[PDB]
Amino acid sequence: SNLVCYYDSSSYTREGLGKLLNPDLEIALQFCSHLVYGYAGLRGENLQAYSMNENLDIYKHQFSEVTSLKRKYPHLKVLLSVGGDHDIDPDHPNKYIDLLEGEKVRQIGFIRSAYELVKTYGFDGLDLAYQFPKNKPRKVIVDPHAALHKEQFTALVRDVKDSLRADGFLLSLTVLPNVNSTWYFDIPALNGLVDFVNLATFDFLTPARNPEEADYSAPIYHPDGSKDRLAHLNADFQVEYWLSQGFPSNKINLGVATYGNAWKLTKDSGLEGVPVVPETSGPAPEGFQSQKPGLLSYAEICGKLSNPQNQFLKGNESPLRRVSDPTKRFGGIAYRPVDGQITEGIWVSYDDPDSASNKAAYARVKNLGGVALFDLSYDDFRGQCSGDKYPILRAIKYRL
Ligand SMILES: *[C@@H]1O[C@H](CO)[C@@H](O[C@@H]2O[C@H](CO)[C@@H](O[C@@H]3O[C@H](CO)[C@@H](O)[C@H](O[C@H]4O[C@H](CO)[C@@H](O)[C@H](O)[C@@H]4O)[C@@H]3O)[C@H](O)[C@H]2NC(C)=O)[C@H](O)[C@H]1NC(C)=O
C-alpha cells in the first residue's frame, strides 16, 4: 500500500522544536512511499501557480533539495501540492473559484505555471489540493454555482493531466476537510484523469469552524453518542461515498492527521469528556511548539497526558485526562475541564499511534491504495513522546 507523506515546507523555518530541517525530514523516508511538498498557491493577480515562499523553496533551493532525495531513495515519489488550505488570501478570497470560472487564457496560465514548477524543480507530479468552498459549519447555499463548478473542475483536471502526460508526471487530487464530493467531484470522470485521490477525512469539526461545541474530529464510523452529529462527517462515509461512485478502491488514500484539534472549555462545558461537549469557547491557547491557536502537535499532546509521575501537578498545569472509547471507531480524546483551580479548560480531538494504526487497518480492510499523512511536521519527529521518532508514521506503516 502507499504511504503518502505531506511536508508543509513552512515547517523548515519554524522556531524551536517545531522546526523541521532536512535531516529530520529524511528520517521519515524509510517509511514514506511518496513525499508531497506543500504548498504552492495561486497568484491573486493572474492566478498562476507560484511558491508561497520563494526565498526558501527557490532561492535556497529547498524544492530541489527535497526532490533530489530521490537519489538516496530510488523508489520515492515526490509531488508538489497546490492549495491545501494553506493558500490563505484575504486580499483575493475568490481565487480558486475564479480559476474554475476563468477564460482559456487564464486557465492556460495556471496550467503552464503549475507544469513549470513540477518540471523545473524535479518533481514527479502535481497534487491539486483544491480549495473549494466547504460544508457550512452548523452553529449554535454556500455555492449556488456548485454544479457549474463541478464541470469546470473536471475540465480543469483534464487539461492539467493533458499537460503532464508527455512527461509521465503523476496527478493526484486531495479532497480537503469538509470539501463535499457531491458538490464538486464528478468521480466517474476522474478515474481516467488522476493517479490517486487523497480523502482528508479529518478536521470534520474544528474550533475555528465550530467554536461553541466540540465533537470527534476524525472518527472512522459515525458515533451515535454524539447528539445531532451530521452523518456524512466520518471517514467511512467519505470512503464508501467514493466507492459508491465507482472510483477504484486502490486509487484512494485515507487521510490521517498527526495534529489535534483543541477547543477552549468553559465552566458550562461540564466535567465529562465524551462529546458532544457544550459551551466551548473557540480555540485553545496555542502550543509552544506549534504556535497555532486550536492546534496541537502529537508531541505537545503526548506531553500533557496524565501519568502517575505528573499526578502532582495542579491548577492550570494539571495533566490532561484520556478518554478512549474502547470500540476503536472514533479516535482519541484528551481533556481537562474548567473546575476550581483549573481556569484553563481544554478538549483535544486527535489521533495517536494506536488510533492512526486503526485507520491504517481500516484502509487495508477496504482495499484502499493506502494512507495520506497530514503532515510530517506534526508527527513527533524529535522522539519527544517515547524516544521513537515519527511514532504515528511508523504505527501506520506497520499495518499497511
Ligand atoms: C454533502 O453535504 C450534504 C449536506 O449538505 C450531505 O448530505 C446529507 O447526507 C447525509 C448522509 O447520507 C444525510 O444523512 C442521513 O440521512 C438519512 C435520511 O434523513 C438518515 O436516515 C440517516 O440516519 C441514518 O444514519 C445516521 C448515521 O449513519 C443516523 O444517525 C440516523 O439515525 C440514521 O440511522 C442519515 O442522517 C443527510 O440527510 C443529507 N443532508 C441533506 C441536507 O440533504 C452529503 O452527504 C455530503 N456529501 C458528501 C460526500 O459528504
Short mmCIF file of C-alpha atoms and ligand atoms in Angstrom, two decimals:
data_model
loop_
_atom_site.label_atom_id
_atom_site.label_comp_id
_atom_site.label_asym_id
_atom_site.label_seq_id
_atom_site.Cartn_x
_atom_site.Cartn_y
_atom_site.Cartn_z
CA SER A 1 0.00 0.00 0.00
CA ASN A 2 1.07 3.61 -0.34
CA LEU A 3 2.10 5.90 2.47
CA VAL A 4 1.85 9.44 1.17
CA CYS A 5 3.63 11.84 3.47
CA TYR A 6 2.77 15.53 3.36
CA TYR A 7 5.52 18.01 4.14
CA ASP A 8 4.48 21.60 4.91
CA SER A 9 7.67 23.46 3.99
CA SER A 10 6.70 26.32 6.30
CA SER A 11 7.94 23.86 8.91
CA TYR A 12 11.50 24.46 7.71
CA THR A 13 11.50 27.95 9.22
CA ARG A 14 9.60 27.27 12.43
CA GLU A 15 11.36 28.35 15.61
CA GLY A 16 12.45 25.83 18.22
CA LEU A 17 11.16 22.29 18.49
CA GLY A 18 8.66 22.82 15.69
CA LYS A 19 11.49 23.33 13.22
CA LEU A 20 11.78 20.50 10.69
CA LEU A 21 15.17 20.56 8.92
CA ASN A 22 16.13 18.21 6.14
CA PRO A 23 17.99 15.61 8.23
CA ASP A 24 14.88 15.16 10.37
CA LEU A 25 12.74 15.11 7.21
CA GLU A 26 14.85 12.37 5.70
CA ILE A 27 14.25 10.02 8.58
CA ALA A 28 10.56 9.77 7.58
CA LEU A 29 11.65 8.48 4.18
CA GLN A 30 12.28 4.94 5.25
CA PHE A 31 8.52 4.72 5.81
CA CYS A 32 7.01 7.01 3.15
CA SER A 33 6.33 5.78 -0.40
CA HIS A 34 5.56 9.29 -1.53
CA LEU A 35 6.60 12.73 -0.33
CA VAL A 36 4.35 15.66 -1.08
CA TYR A 37 5.83 19.13 -0.83
CA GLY A 38 3.35 21.73 0.37
CA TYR A 39 2.17 24.19 -0.60
CA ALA A 40 2.19 26.22 -3.78
CA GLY A 41 -0.57 28.85 -4.08
CA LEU A 42 -2.44 30.93 -6.68
CA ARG A 43 -1.30 34.45 -7.55
CA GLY A 44 -4.23 36.80 -6.99
CA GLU A 45 -3.13 38.92 -9.97
CA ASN A 46 -3.36 36.24 -12.64
CA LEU A 47 -3.98 33.00 -10.73
CA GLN A 48 -0.79 31.31 -11.93
CA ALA A 49 0.76 28.68 -9.63
CA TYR A 50 3.62 30.02 -7.54
CA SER A 51 5.76 29.26 -4.48
CA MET A 52 4.45 30.89 -1.31
CA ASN A 53 8.00 31.15 -0.01
CA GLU A 54 10.29 31.76 -2.99
CA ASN A 55 13.22 32.67 -0.75
CA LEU A 56 13.24 29.16 0.70
CA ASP A 57 11.74 27.00 -2.00
CA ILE A 58 13.59 28.56 -4.88
CA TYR A 59 16.42 30.87 -3.78
CA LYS A 60 17.71 28.49 -1.10
CA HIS A 61 16.94 25.51 -3.29
CA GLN A 62 14.52 23.76 -0.92
CA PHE A 63 12.32 22.42 -3.72
CA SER A 64 15.23 20.60 -5.34
CA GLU A 65 16.89 19.67 -2.07
CA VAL A 66 13.74 17.71 -1.37
CA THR A 67 13.25 16.25 -4.84
CA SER A 68 16.92 15.27 -5.08
CA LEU A 69 16.23 13.00 -2.12
CA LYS A 70 15.13 10.55 -4.82
CA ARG A 71 18.83 9.99 -5.48
CA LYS A 72 19.04 8.43 -1.99
CA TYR A 73 15.66 6.72 -2.18
CA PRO A 74 15.25 5.47 -5.75
CA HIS A 75 11.59 4.30 -5.32
CA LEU A 76 10.41 7.51 -3.61
CA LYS A 77 7.90 9.65 -5.48
CA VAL A 78 7.88 13.40 -4.77
CA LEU A 79 4.95 15.62 -5.67
CA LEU A 80 4.17 19.30 -5.40
CA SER A 81 0.86 20.28 -3.85
CA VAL A 82 -1.21 23.37 -4.73
CA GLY A 83 -3.61 24.97 -2.20
CA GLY A 84 -4.13 22.55 0.68
CA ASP A 85 -5.99 25.17 2.72
CA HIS A 86 -2.54 26.77 3.21
CA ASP A 87 -3.20 29.33 0.43
CA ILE A 88 -4.68 31.96 2.71
CA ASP A 89 -5.51 35.11 0.78
CA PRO A 90 -7.94 37.56 2.38
CA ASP A 91 -6.94 40.02 -0.31
CA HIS A 92 -8.19 37.66 -3.06
CA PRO A 93 -10.67 35.34 -1.36
CA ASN A 94 -12.23 34.05 -4.60
CA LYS A 95 -9.09 32.76 -6.38
CA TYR A 96 -9.97 29.05 -6.61
CA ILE A 97 -13.45 29.67 -7.91
CA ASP A 98 -12.27 32.39 -10.28
CA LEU A 99 -9.75 29.93 -11.73
CA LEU A 100 -12.58 27.45 -12.39
CA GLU A 101 -14.71 30.24 -13.92
CA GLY A 102 -11.69 31.58 -15.85
CA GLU A 103 -11.32 32.08 -19.59
CA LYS A 104 -8.94 29.83 -21.53
CA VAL A 105 -6.09 32.32 -21.38
CA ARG A 106 -6.26 32.45 -17.60
CA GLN A 107 -6.53 28.68 -17.20
CA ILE A 108 -3.68 28.13 -19.60
CA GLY A 109 -1.55 30.46 -17.49
CA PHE A 110 -2.18 28.30 -14.42
CA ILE A 111 -1.63 25.04 -16.31
CA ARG A 112 1.68 26.28 -17.70
CA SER A 113 2.88 27.71 -14.39
CA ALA A 114 1.97 24.58 -12.45
CA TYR A 115 3.69 22.45 -15.11
CA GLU A 116 6.82 24.66 -14.96
CA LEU A 117 7.07 24.21 -11.18
CA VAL A 118 6.82 20.43 -11.39
CA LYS A 119 9.32 20.11 -14.20
CA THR A 120 11.83 22.78 -13.32
CA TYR A 121 12.38 21.54 -9.77
CA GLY A 122 12.49 17.80 -10.33
CA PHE A 123 9.07 16.79 -9.01
CA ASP A 124 7.33 13.62 -10.22
CA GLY A 125 3.89 15.21 -10.39
CA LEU A 126 1.26 17.56 -9.05
CA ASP A 127 -1.28 17.35 -6.24
CA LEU A 128 -4.37 19.53 -6.74
CA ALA A 129 -5.46 20.13 -3.15
CA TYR A 130 -8.17 22.36 -4.50
CA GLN A 131 -9.51 24.93 -2.03
CA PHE A 132 -13.21 24.64 -2.79
CA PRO A 133 -15.84 26.19 -0.55
CA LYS A 134 -16.53 23.80 2.33
CA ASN A 135 -19.60 22.45 4.13
CA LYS A 136 -21.24 25.28 6.04
CA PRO A 137 -20.44 24.89 9.71
CA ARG A 138 -23.53 24.21 11.80
CA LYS A 139 -23.67 26.85 14.51
CA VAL A 140 -25.21 27.21 17.96
CA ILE A 141 -26.50 27.63 -0.08
CA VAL A 142 -22.78 28.32 0.17
CA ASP A 143 -22.21 27.92 -3.61
CA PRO A 144 -25.23 28.32 -5.94
CA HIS A 145 -22.97 27.57 -8.86
CA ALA A 146 -21.65 24.27 -7.47
CA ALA A 147 -22.78 22.24 -10.49
CA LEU A 148 -21.13 24.65 -12.88
CA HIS A 149 -18.10 24.47 -10.64
CA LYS A 150 -18.05 20.70 -10.72
CA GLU A 151 -17.97 20.76 -14.51
CA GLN A 152 -15.26 23.40 -14.71
CA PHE A 153 -13.13 21.38 -12.26
CA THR A 154 -13.39 18.17 -14.25
CA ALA A 155 -12.37 20.14 -17.33
CA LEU A 156 -9.51 21.78 -15.44
CA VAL A 157 -8.27 18.39 -14.19
CA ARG A 158 -8.42 17.00 -17.74
CA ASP A 159 -6.35 19.87 -19.09
CA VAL A 160 -3.88 19.64 -16.21
CA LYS A 161 -3.47 15.92 -16.85
CA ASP A 162 -3.02 16.65 -20.55
CA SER A 163 -0.09 18.96 -19.74
CA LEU A 164 1.60 16.23 -17.67
CA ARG A 165 1.12 13.23 -19.95
CA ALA A 166 4.20 13.54 -22.16
CA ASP A 167 6.48 13.53 -19.14
CA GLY A 168 4.55 10.76 -17.38
CA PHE A 169 4.10 13.07 -14.38
CA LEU A 170 1.54 12.00 -11.78
CA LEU A 171 -1.55 13.90 -10.86
CA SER A 172 -3.29 13.44 -7.53
CA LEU A 173 -6.31 15.23 -6.12
CA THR A 174 -6.85 15.93 -2.43
CA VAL A 175 -10.43 16.40 -1.15
CA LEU A 176 -9.73 18.75 1.75
CA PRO A 177 -11.53 18.65 5.10
CA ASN A 178 -15.26 19.33 4.75
CA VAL A 179 -14.94 19.68 0.98
CA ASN A 180 -18.10 17.97 -0.25
CA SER A 181 -17.62 15.50 -3.11
CA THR A 182 -21.30 15.66 -4.09
CA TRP A 183 -20.99 19.32 -4.90
CA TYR A 184 -17.71 19.32 -6.77
CA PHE A 185 -16.32 15.90 -7.76
CA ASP A 186 -17.54 14.12 -10.89
CA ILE A 187 -16.00 10.91 -9.69
CA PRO A 188 -16.57 8.64 -12.72
CA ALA A 189 -14.84 11.26 -14.86
CA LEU A 190 -11.73 11.35 -12.66
CA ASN A 191 -10.53 7.73 -12.74
CA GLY A 192 -9.15 8.21 -16.25
CA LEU A 193 -7.55 11.53 -15.32
CA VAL A 194 -5.81 11.06 -12.00
CA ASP A 195 -3.37 8.60 -10.48
CA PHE A 196 -4.92 8.67 -7.00
CA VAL A 197 -7.08 10.68 -4.63
CA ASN A 198 -6.42 11.58 -1.01
CA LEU A 199 -9.52 11.91 1.13
CA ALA A 200 -8.74 14.30 4.03
CA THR A 201 -11.09 12.54 6.42
CA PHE A 202 -10.18 14.54 9.49
CA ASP A 203 -10.89 18.04 10.83
CA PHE A 204 -14.59 17.27 10.38
CA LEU A 205 -15.09 19.67 13.26
CA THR A 206 -12.54 22.28 14.37
CA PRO A 207 -12.52 25.11 16.95
CA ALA A 208 -12.29 27.56 14.05
CA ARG A 209 -15.39 26.25 12.34
CA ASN A 210 -17.23 25.09 15.49
CA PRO A 211 -16.17 27.41 18.33
CA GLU A 212 -19.17 26.65 20.53
CA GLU A 213 -19.28 22.84 20.66
CA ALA A 214 -16.69 20.05 20.41
CA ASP A 215 -17.06 16.59 18.90
CA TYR A 216 -14.84 13.87 17.40
CA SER A 217 -12.87 15.44 14.54
CA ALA A 218 -11.83 12.23 12.69
CA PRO A 219 -13.88 9.18 13.66
CA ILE A 220 -13.86 6.20 11.32
CA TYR A 221 -17.53 5.46 11.86
CA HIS A 222 -20.45 7.62 12.96
CA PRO A 223 -20.72 7.92 16.75
CA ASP A 224 -24.38 7.60 17.75
CA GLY A 225 -23.44 9.11 21.12
CA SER A 226 -22.72 12.47 19.51
CA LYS A 227 -26.11 14.13 19.52
CA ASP A 228 -27.24 15.51 16.17
CA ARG A 229 -23.85 14.94 14.55
CA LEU A 230 -24.15 15.10 10.74
CA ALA A 231 -23.82 11.53 9.43
CA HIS A 232 -21.59 12.27 6.44
CA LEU A 233 -18.89 13.58 8.85
CA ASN A 234 -16.86 10.37 9.34
CA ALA A 235 -14.10 8.61 7.39
CA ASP A 236 -16.13 5.55 6.45
CA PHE A 237 -18.94 7.65 4.93
CA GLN A 238 -16.43 9.53 2.73
CA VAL A 239 -14.65 6.35 1.60
CA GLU A 240 -17.87 4.48 0.91
CA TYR A 241 -19.12 7.57 -0.96
CA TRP A 242 -16.14 7.47 -3.32
CA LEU A 243 -16.51 3.72 -3.75
CA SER A 244 -20.25 4.19 -4.37
CA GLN A 245 -19.43 6.45 -7.30
CA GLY A 246 -17.25 3.81 -8.94
CA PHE A 247 -13.74 5.02 -8.03
CA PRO A 248 -11.34 2.08 -7.68
CA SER A 249 -10.64 1.44 -4.06
CA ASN A 250 -6.92 1.02 -4.72
CA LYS A 251 -6.70 4.56 -6.07
CA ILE A 252 -7.92 6.03 -2.82
CA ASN A 253 -5.73 7.12 0.11
CA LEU A 254 -7.25 7.55 3.55
CA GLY A 255 -6.21 10.89 5.10
CA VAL A 256 -4.84 10.76 8.67
CA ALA A 257 -3.80 13.83 10.66
CA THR A 258 -0.78 13.98 13.00
CA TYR A 259 -2.10 17.07 14.87
CA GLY A 260 -5.03 17.58 17.19
CA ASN A 261 -7.95 19.98 17.22
CA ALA A 262 -8.10 21.78 20.56
CA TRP A 263 -11.06 23.70 21.99
CA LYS A 264 -11.10 26.08 24.98
CA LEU A 265 -13.66 24.86 27.53
CA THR A 266 -15.87 26.89 29.86
CA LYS A 267 -17.36 26.14 33.25
CA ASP A 268 -20.60 25.36 31.46
CA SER A 269 -18.92 22.65 29.32
CA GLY A 270 -19.08 20.33 32.31
CA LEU A 271 -16.69 17.72 33.59
CA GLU A 272 -17.21 14.86 31.15
CA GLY A 273 -15.02 14.35 28.12
CA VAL A 274 -17.24 12.24 25.89
CA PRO A 275 -18.69 14.55 23.18
CA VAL A 276 -20.72 16.43 22.24
CA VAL A 277 -19.01 18.91 24.56
CA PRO A 278 -21.13 22.04 25.03
CA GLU A 279 -20.45 25.71 25.64
CA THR A 280 -16.92 25.70 24.31
CA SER A 281 -15.19 29.00 23.55
CA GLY A 282 -13.19 28.72 20.36
CA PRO A 283 -9.60 27.54 20.02
CA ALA A 284 -7.44 26.59 22.98
CA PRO A 285 -4.30 28.63 23.59
CA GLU A 286 -1.56 27.77 21.10
CA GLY A 287 1.10 25.20 21.97
CA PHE A 288 4.68 26.40 22.48
CA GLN A 289 5.99 24.20 19.65
CA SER A 290 3.23 24.60 17.05
CA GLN A 291 2.12 28.22 17.74
CA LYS A 292 -1.31 27.86 16.11
CA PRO A 293 -4.37 28.53 18.32
CA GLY A 294 -6.65 25.47 18.31
CA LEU A 295 -3.96 23.13 17.00
CA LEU A 296 -1.50 20.92 18.92
CA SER A 297 1.20 18.60 17.60
CA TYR A 298 1.30 14.98 18.77
CA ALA A 299 4.34 15.68 20.94
CA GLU A 300 2.57 18.60 22.64
CA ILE A 301 -0.45 16.44 23.36
CA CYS A 302 1.50 13.37 24.48
CA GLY A 303 3.49 15.64 26.76
CA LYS A 304 0.39 16.75 28.64
CA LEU A 305 -1.25 13.38 29.29
CA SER A 306 -1.63 12.30 32.89
CA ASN A 307 0.79 9.73 34.34
CA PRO A 308 1.45 8.64 37.95
CA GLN A 309 4.56 10.84 37.79
CA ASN A 310 2.82 14.09 36.77
CA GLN A 311 -0.09 13.34 39.08
CA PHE A 312 1.01 16.08 41.48
CA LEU A 313 0.62 18.94 39.05
CA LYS A 314 -2.34 21.15 39.90
CA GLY A 315 -4.37 24.05 38.55
CA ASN A 316 -3.53 25.11 35.04
CA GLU A 317 -0.65 22.59 34.94
CA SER A 318 -2.78 19.60 35.84
CA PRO A 319 -2.34 16.91 33.19
CA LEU A 320 -4.95 16.08 30.55
CA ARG A 321 -7.18 13.05 31.00
CA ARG A 322 -7.51 10.41 28.28
CA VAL A 323 -10.98 9.45 27.06
CA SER A 324 -10.74 6.40 24.85
CA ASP A 325 -13.85 4.65 23.61
CA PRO A 326 -12.77 1.02 23.51
CA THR A 327 -14.51 0.23 20.20
CA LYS A 328 -11.62 1.95 18.35
CA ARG A 329 -14.14 3.53 15.97
CA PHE A 330 -13.82 7.19 16.84
CA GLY A 331 -10.31 8.32 17.78
CA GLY A 332 -8.56 9.94 20.71
CA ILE A 333 -9.63 12.45 23.29
CA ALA A 334 -7.58 14.26 25.93
CA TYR A 335 -9.04 16.95 28.10
CA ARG A 336 -9.10 18.99 31.30
CA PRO A 337 -12.35 20.70 32.38
CA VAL A 338 -12.83 24.10 33.98
CA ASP A 339 -13.05 23.30 37.69
CA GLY A 340 -11.87 25.12 40.81
CA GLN A 341 -8.16 25.91 40.43
CA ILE A 342 -8.34 24.89 36.83
CA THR A 343 -9.42 28.00 34.95
CA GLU A 344 -7.95 26.92 31.66
CA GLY A 345 -10.03 24.07 30.26
CA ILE A 346 -9.18 22.30 27.03
CA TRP A 347 -10.60 19.45 24.94
CA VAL A 348 -8.38 17.86 22.25
CA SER A 349 -9.51 15.56 19.43
CA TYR A 350 -6.57 13.71 17.92
CA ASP A 351 -5.07 10.51 16.60
CA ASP A 352 -2.16 8.88 18.44
CA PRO A 353 -0.08 5.99 17.06
CA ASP A 354 -2.67 3.40 18.18
CA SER A 355 -5.62 5.22 16.65
CA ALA A 356 -3.73 6.06 13.47
CA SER A 357 -2.82 2.37 13.29
CA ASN A 358 -6.57 1.65 13.45
CA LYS A 359 -7.13 3.92 10.46
CA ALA A 360 -4.39 2.06 8.61
CA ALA A 361 -6.06 -1.26 9.40
CA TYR A 362 -9.38 0.07 8.08
CA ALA A 363 -7.71 1.21 4.87
CA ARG A 364 -6.26 -2.26 4.45
CA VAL A 365 -9.66 -3.83 5.03
CA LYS A 366 -11.34 -1.56 2.48
CA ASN A 367 -8.67 -2.44 -0.06
CA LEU A 368 -7.70 1.21 -0.36
CA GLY A 369 -4.50 2.34 -2.06
CA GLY A 370 -3.06 3.45 1.26
CA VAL A 371 -2.84 6.33 3.68
CA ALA A 372 -2.06 10.04 3.28
CA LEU A 373 -0.49 11.62 6.35
CA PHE A 374 -1.03 15.31 7.12
CA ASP A 375 1.74 16.15 7.91
CA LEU A 376 5.27 15.10 8.88
CA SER A 377 5.90 18.33 10.75
CA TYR A 378 3.38 17.48 13.46
CA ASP A 379 4.35 13.84 13.86
CA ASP A 380 6.79 13.60 16.81
CA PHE A 381 9.89 13.66 14.61
CA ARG A 382 12.16 14.52 17.53
CA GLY A 383 11.14 11.47 19.54
CA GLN A 384 9.85 13.50 22.49
CA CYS A 385 6.92 11.32 23.45
CA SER A 386 8.54 7.89 23.72
CA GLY A 387 12.02 8.32 22.26
CA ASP A 388 10.94 6.71 19.00
CA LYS A 389 10.91 9.24 16.18
CA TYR A 390 7.81 9.54 13.96
CA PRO A 391 5.69 7.31 16.15
CA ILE A 392 2.46 7.96 14.18
CA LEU A 393 4.08 7.34 10.81
CA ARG A 394 5.70 4.08 11.89
CA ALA A 395 2.48 2.78 13.51
CA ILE A 396 0.58 3.37 10.27
CA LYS A 397 3.21 1.67 8.13
CA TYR A 398 3.22 -1.36 10.45
CA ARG A 399 -0.40 -2.01 9.48
CA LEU A 400 -0.49 -1.28 5.74
C1 LIG B 1 -22.55 16.94 1.14
O1 LIG B 1 -23.31 17.68 2.11
C2 LIG B 1 -24.64 17.16 2.26
C3 LIG B 1 -25.36 18.04 3.27
O2 LIG B 1 -25.47 19.36 2.77
C4 LIG B 1 -24.64 15.70 2.65
O3 LIG B 1 -25.99 15.23 2.71
C5 LIG B 1 -26.52 14.76 3.80
O4 LIG B 1 -26.03 13.42 3.64
C6 LIG B 1 -26.31 12.66 4.84
C7 LIG B 1 -25.59 11.35 4.72
O5 LIG B 1 -26.23 10.44 3.84
C8 LIG B 1 -27.81 12.54 5.08
O6 LIG B 1 -27.98 11.90 6.37
C9 LIG B 1 -28.51 10.55 6.55
O7 LIG B 1 -29.85 10.97 6.23
C10 LIG B 1 -30.82 9.91 6.28
C11 LIG B 1 -32.16 10.47 5.91
O8 LIG B 1 -32.52 11.63 6.63
C12 LIG B 1 -30.88 9.27 7.65
O9 LIG B 1 -31.73 8.12 7.62
C13 LIG B 1 -29.51 8.80 8.13
O10 LIG B 1 -29.66 8.49 9.52
C14 LIG B 1 -29.15 7.31 9.29
O11 LIG B 1 -27.75 7.33 9.54
C15 LIG B 1 -27.31 8.28 10.53
C16 LIG B 1 -25.84 7.95 10.74
O12 LIG B 1 -25.48 6.87 9.89
C17 LIG B 1 -28.03 8.08 11.86
O13 LIG B 1 -27.57 8.98 12.85
C18 LIG B 1 -29.53 8.18 11.66
O14 LIG B 1 -30.18 7.91 12.91
C19 LIG B 1 -29.94 7.11 10.61
O15 LIG B 1 -29.62 5.81 11.10
C20 LIG B 1 -28.50 9.98 8.00
O16 LIG B 1 -28.91 11.02 8.86
C21 LIG B 1 -28.45 13.94 5.13
O17 LIG B 1 -29.87 13.82 5.17
C22 LIG B 1 -28.06 14.78 3.89
N1 LIG B 1 -28.48 16.13 4.12
C23 LIG B 1 -29.14 16.97 3.33
C24 LIG B 1 -29.19 18.41 3.83
O18 LIG B 1 -29.67 16.71 2.26
C25 LIG B 1 -23.81 14.84 1.68
O19 LIG B 1 -23.65 13.52 2.18
C26 LIG B 1 -22.41 15.47 1.51
N2 LIG B 1 -21.62 14.72 0.55
C27 LIG B 1 -20.52 14.08 0.97
C28 LIG B 1 -19.84 13.11 0.03
O20 LIG B 1 -20.04 14.30 2.09
#
